[PDB]
Design a protein around this ligand. Structure first.
Ligand SMILES: CCCC[S@@](=N)(=O)CC[C@H](N)C(=O)O
Ligand SMILES: CCCC[S@@](=N)(=O)CC[C@H](N)C(=O)O
Ligand SMILES: [Mg+2]
Ligand SMILES: [Mg+2]
Lengths: 438, 436
């Protein structure tokens, strides 16, 4: 039946994510670099397809196909997918506690290694591929990524590196109202540079130090200015679901999915789409699934759909995969901690937030901020996050042990790798493929 | 109608299932210890561990009185052995991929709680450091009855109870004929499994002169309920003959009114007639019969399924190998025949000798004009054939025993080599080496 969507419907779609506190869940996604253990070469698509087929067969996953190509797996509310450079991704189910989150991570790592060991394949938990050049990375046989690869050079010089050479750990979290959403969004944006610093894990490029602690985070500043960043309008009095929808309506599209394929709609807006005026699909009107797809092509430091996504942290070893969601659950899921965070960050200017975002990639917790170091803010933030987890009552506070020494010493994971590179590793990155081996 | 002997025979036979319904059930036990002192984990620490696991990972609590003694989730159980050994009895699973993932899930949950408590778990067949009197005892009425009985029937049964760990597998049969064949293959080959998995060379911080002290212990526990069951190889053998055997094995206890009554020195035959002094006039249920069948401890046991009992506890890759070994041998009809062919002319005296000698000499046990190693070479290739033919790509689960069979050197001998070299003649490093 033909019943066109309006902007008002798009607003209501986001708002439809509201849920009461007792239904709030924790969704965790992470990406990993696969490599051949003996050559350290990136895992190619033929090896990826064997890995996926074996996982499906052994562990009962449904195969996700694009044409005649396996590109992912599905089992209940979990998915395994591929990033543009073959980075191997788990999107976990919405879970109630971080004990469940970490068991989900462990189950995945067991299944992957159970198959990959016989194949001579290992997985690396870092934010940026430390050894190989961009043109050494295999590309995935996915139509949507072909469109994106062709567009990236038009809007930045590092977007192809984002696609091919970066890995993240992220957390998805729920809101209960527009007021709650706004508060969470503001807390999440303001504190995102702190997450980035604590999880900074990408100091190598092409076998050498790149001069950054999170090269991955820097990459996101020269990807696409239209769909990235610290979203200053979120801190405007006017902000709400409607202001986010207008933002998103004017972010240019990548594609529209019709008839089993991705149509290139670059340079066009979802506005045009709503009015049936897309030159890629002329006269065609969008569905809620089109809107959801479009929403998934926007890449700010925190993203809004029917839930909220914290996107600032580098991939890392398993204890840090469990720490990242713990960090945000502690801060955002306790009302008093959330208020404390808003209080702490209340007087930070847009230029200050933007400065932290840009400088943290280089200096981490030693980034100057006001009359001290970001480290001192991270101290306060970490104690607050542990307060939040204590009060949840589920005994989850131990999941923050993995970042306690970072905060305490002010020394990022990336600086620990640098120290090994310059010492015991004899200035080769090759030992990182054992050090950060899953 | 009171149960009769014919009902007891039919109980066992009711386990028969068609090949498409055959499953794999895996149980293993681990020693818990304090990481810093190496001391055995005490009941108060076990109770905290079980309560935390239940709460985090959604397990139902199993209580004896006001004491938590285990957990239940679906068809899986976690229980305690008499010395606090921490046991998983897994679900009936279709493939060994599922088996090993089951093992991994358990190890993760246990370690997720135990790390914060300063507790580790050791995968060995015999407690390598501590004396019998050093081992905490579990607050479980059935084990109190057993502890009091053991000294009457052997000198090492208390060590069985307090200081041993096993990995075992439960498997199904489709008919009486199939049960008989699997029982015979299981019993004949059990000393080979014992040698491959031999992992108990230390007692009280020193070499004890064995490769599997655990296996040896089972030779001086109780002669009435252990061993290689030679009657299984008689022409007469079937469900009926096993029932008679079990009816004549003395009882341990009967469970009534929320407790265990001491029925030692009494027989299930008396029970059937209502003449058990411990429960006078009472007649048995099928649950009573099950409980009784669970107090019989031969190298292979029969209930409504079959249980392979010969292998020492070990690290995780060997927990996955033990079920694979028997699945390869018993769940392929051609391999099963090839095993019965290979063992056809073994005498009762030969089988008995191998069972008693393997604990000392392992795969270097002399057998006829060579070594048990040479038989294990043939048996391993056959077990791999069976797994290849299953079509589930499970053969890799035997990689963990391939070098043992190749070199003829048991895991226990590898530990001894470390003890005599890098460890500097202390067992304390084994608590890192075989740490889960
Ligand atoms: C293909 C680009 C969109 C997918 S993403 N936003 O999940 C990529 C995350 C990137 N690999 C990172 O490390 O942030
Ligand atoms: C309490 C003794 C009967 C239970 S058992 N057969 O499961 C003990 C197994 C023992 N822990 C071993 O390693 O053989
Ligand atoms: Mg991703
Ligand atoms: Mg047991």
């Amino acid at each position: 039946a033909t019943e066109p969507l309006t902007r008002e419907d798009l607003i209501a779609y986001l708002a439809s994510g509201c849920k009461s506190k007792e239904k709030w869940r924790i969704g965790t996604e992470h990406e990993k670099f696969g490599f051949e253990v003996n050559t350290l070469r990136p895992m190619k698509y033929d090896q990826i397809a064997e890995l996926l087929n074996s996982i499906a067969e052994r562990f009962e996953w449904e195969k996700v196909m694009e044409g005649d190509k396996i590109i992912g797996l599905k089992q209940g509310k979990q998915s395994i997918s591929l990033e543009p450079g073959g980075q191997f991704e788990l999107s976990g189910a919405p879970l109630e506690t971080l004990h469940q989150t970490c068991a989900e991570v462990n189950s995945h790592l067991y299944q992957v290694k159970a198959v990959a060991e016989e194949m001579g394949i290992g997985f690396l938990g870092m934010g940026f591929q430390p050894k190989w050049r961009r043109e050494d990375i295999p590309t995935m046989p996915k139509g949507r990524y072909d469109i994106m690869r062709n567009y990236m050079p038009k809007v930045g010089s590092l977007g192809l590196d984002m696609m091919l050479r970066t890995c993240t750990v992220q957390v998805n979290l729920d809101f209960s109202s527009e007021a709650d959403m706004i508060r969470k969004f503001r807390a999440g944006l303001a504190l995102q540079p702190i997450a980035t610093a604590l999880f900074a894990n990408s100091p190598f490029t092409e076998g050498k130090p790149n001069g950054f602690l999170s090269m991955r985070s820097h990459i996101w500043t020269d990807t696409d200015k239209d769909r990235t960043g610290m979203l200053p309008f979120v801190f405007d009095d006017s902000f709400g679901f409607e202001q986010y929808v207008d933002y998103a309506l004017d972010v240019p599209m990548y594609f529209a999915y019709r008839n089993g394929k991705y149509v290139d709609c670059t340079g066009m807006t979802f506005r045009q789409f709503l009015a049936g005026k897309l030159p890629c699909l002329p006269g065609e009107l969008p569905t809620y699934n089109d809107w959801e797809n479009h929403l998934t092509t926007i890449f700010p430091e925190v993203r809004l759909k029917r839930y909220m996504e914290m996107r600032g942290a580098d991939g890392g070893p398993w204890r840090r995969l469990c720490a990242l969601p713990a960090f945000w659950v502690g801060l955002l899921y306790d009302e008093d901690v959330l208020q404390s965070v808003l209080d702490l960050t209340a007087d930070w200017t847009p230029a200050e937030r933007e400065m932290l975002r840009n400088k943290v990639p280089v200096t981490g917790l030693k980034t100057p901020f006001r009359d001290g170091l970001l480290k001192h803010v991270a101290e306060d933030v970490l104690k607050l996050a542990k307060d939040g987890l204590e009060r949840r009552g589920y005994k989850e506070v131990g999941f923050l042990n993995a970042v306690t020494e970072v905060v305490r010493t002010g020394v990022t994971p990336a600086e620990n790798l640098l120290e090994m590179y310059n010492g015991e590793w004899g200035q080769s990155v090759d030992p990182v493929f054992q050090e950060l081996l899953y």
